[PDB]
């Protein structure tokens, strides 16, 4: 699978980080890491994914 | 030569553009005519970017800006409708009246005939956020002049012979009611913080 | 010299149409304090059900 | 990808890291982990 993943990072920009502050219910500062090969965001219903 | 617009509708449009709102409770004829000819009035007002929003439940009309649906101009600007920002005292008074109207509607229902509120009831409530300016005469004069100022916008009726007032239905359609609640609660909390 | 002569009206200007939408409310400054707090919320360790 | 705890097994097979977000009152917290770190965390849950 990583053989196809060589395209990512090489040719195109890829998302790697998001930083929040007082956005919605995220009191204070926060941050999440995105792996260059793909990420999945999980949690209970209505927690802050959207 | 050309046909002329009916006299009653001309009177209605001129009055509506003068005061900004009609009311079945105080102008039943004119109010009835406009609702029977909605297309005519909306056609007379469309060239000016003006348009009427009809509130049948409260029996009230009011002029609102017509401008297009969320163009690049996120906030509307209009040559005739000159935007105004009320000063602090007016904002607090409008918040108090808004809260009273909403509370009364919560009990008697939406559109129920508004209960008459005594001038004396308001003075202590303003004193919460403004203290005592120095004398009862001064505070009462301030309240009376503020109610006179607000009557211009059509929010409240003039004080009657017994010194009571009524809350006009217009107060429900203010620009952004969330501003009143937040500011009012914020000052109400700051006073408790400092006391 | 405060009489009112019977001269006509010209250039009658229509402005100040009192649309109720046009109002805005008072802006009150809040000079209490400004928040540095940017704790990284390292307490985000998983606490989830079965 | 975003999923409210559905078809997670599929996510495991085509992504390498997951962001676990949980609610608590009026504040929401977010953490970033790898699939293997979360697997170890589960193995800790495995003592139950
Ligand atoms: Mg969502």
User: What string of H, E and C letters represents the secondary structure of chain C?
Assistant: CCCCCCCCCCCCCCCCCCCHHHEECCCCCCCCCCCCCCCCCCCCCCCCCC
Cα separation, D22 vs B3, whole angstroms? 70
CB contact under 8 A, C41 and D22: no
- Chain A residues within 8 A of D23 when measuring between CB atoms: 25, 43-44, 46-48
Q: Which two tokens stand for residue B4?
A: 């002329």
Edge-to-edge strand order for the sheet containing D27-34? D2-3, A39-42, D17-24, D27-34
Residue numbers in B near C13 (CB within 8 A): none
Judged by CB atoms within 8 Å, which residues 8-47 of D form the interface with A? 8, 11, 14-23, 26-32, 34
Paired with B63 in beta bridges are B52
Phi and psi torsions of B105, nearest 5°? -65, -35
Distance A46 CA to ligand 1 centre (A): 7
Residues at Cβ < 5 Å from ligand 1 ion: A 50
**A1 contact residues in D (CB cutoff 8 A):** 14
Q: To the nearest whole angstrom, how far is the Cα of C10 from the nearest Cα of chain B?
A: 18
CA distance D35 to A3: 20
Under an 8 A CB cutoff, do C23 and B81 touch? no
- How would you class B40 by CB atoms within 10 Å of its CB: exposed for 0-12, middle for 13-18, buried for 19 or more? middle
CA–CA dist A48, C4 (Å, integer): 70
3-state SS assignment for residue B75: coil
Asked if the Cβ–Cβ distance from C38 to A44 is below 8 Å, we say: no
Method of determination? cryo-EM
- C20 to chain B, closest Cα gap in Å: 6
Pull the structure tokens for residue B97: 């009246």
* DSSP type of residue D13: T
> Which residues lie below 8 Å from residue B7, measured CB to CB, with a gap of 6+?
none
Is the Cβ pair D29, C48 closer than 8 Å? no
Q: What resolution, expressed in A, was reported for this entry?
A: 3.7
C-alpha to C-alpha distance for B167 and B100, rounded to whole angstroms: 9
């Amino acid at each position: 699978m990583n053989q196809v993943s060589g395209l990512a990072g090489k040719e195109s920009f890829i998302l790697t980080r998001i930083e929040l502050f007082n956005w919605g219910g995220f009191h204070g500062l926060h941050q999440a890491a995105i792996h260059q090969d793909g990420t999945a965001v999980i949690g209970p219903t209505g927690s802050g994914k959207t | 030569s050309e046909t002329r617009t009916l006299q009653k509708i001309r009177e209605a449009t001129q009055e509506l553009l003068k005061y900004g709102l009609l009311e079945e409770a105080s102008k039943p004829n004119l109010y009835r005519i406009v609702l029977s000819h909605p297309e005519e009035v909306t056609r007379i007002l469309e060239p000016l970017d003006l348009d009427i929003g009809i509130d049948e439940i409260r029996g009230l009309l009011y002029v609102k800006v017509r401008l297009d649906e969320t163009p690049a101009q996120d906030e509307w600007a209009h040559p005739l409708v000159r935007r105004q920002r009320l000063n602090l005292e007016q904002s607090l008074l409008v918040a108090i009246l808004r809260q009273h109207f909403v509370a009364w509607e919560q009990e008697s229902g939406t559109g129920a005939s508004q209960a008459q509120i005594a001038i004396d009831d308001l003075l202590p409530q303003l004193q919460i956020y403004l203290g005592d300016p120095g004398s009862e005469s001064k505070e009462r004069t301030r309240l009376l002049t503020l109610l006179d100022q607000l009557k211009g916008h059509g929010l409240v009726t003039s004080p009657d012979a017994h010194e009571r007032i009524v809350i006009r239905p217009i107060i429900a359609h203010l620009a952004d009611p969330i501003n009143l609640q937040a500011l009012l609660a914020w000052l109400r909390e700051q006073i408790a913080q400092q006391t | 010299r405060k009489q009112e002569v019977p001269l006509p009206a010209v250039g009658v200007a229509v402005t100040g149409i009192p649309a109720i939408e046009r109002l805005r409310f008072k802006e009150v400054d809040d000079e209490a304090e400004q928040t540095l707090d940017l704790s990284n919320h390292a307490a985000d360790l998983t606490q989830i059900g079965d | 990808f975003i999923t409210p705890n559905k078809e997670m097994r599929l996510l495991r097979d085509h992504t390498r890291s997951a962001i676990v977000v949980h609610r608590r009152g009026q504040n929401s917290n977010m953490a970033s982990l790898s699939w293997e770190e979360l697997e170890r965390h589960y193995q800790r849950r495995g003592n139950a």
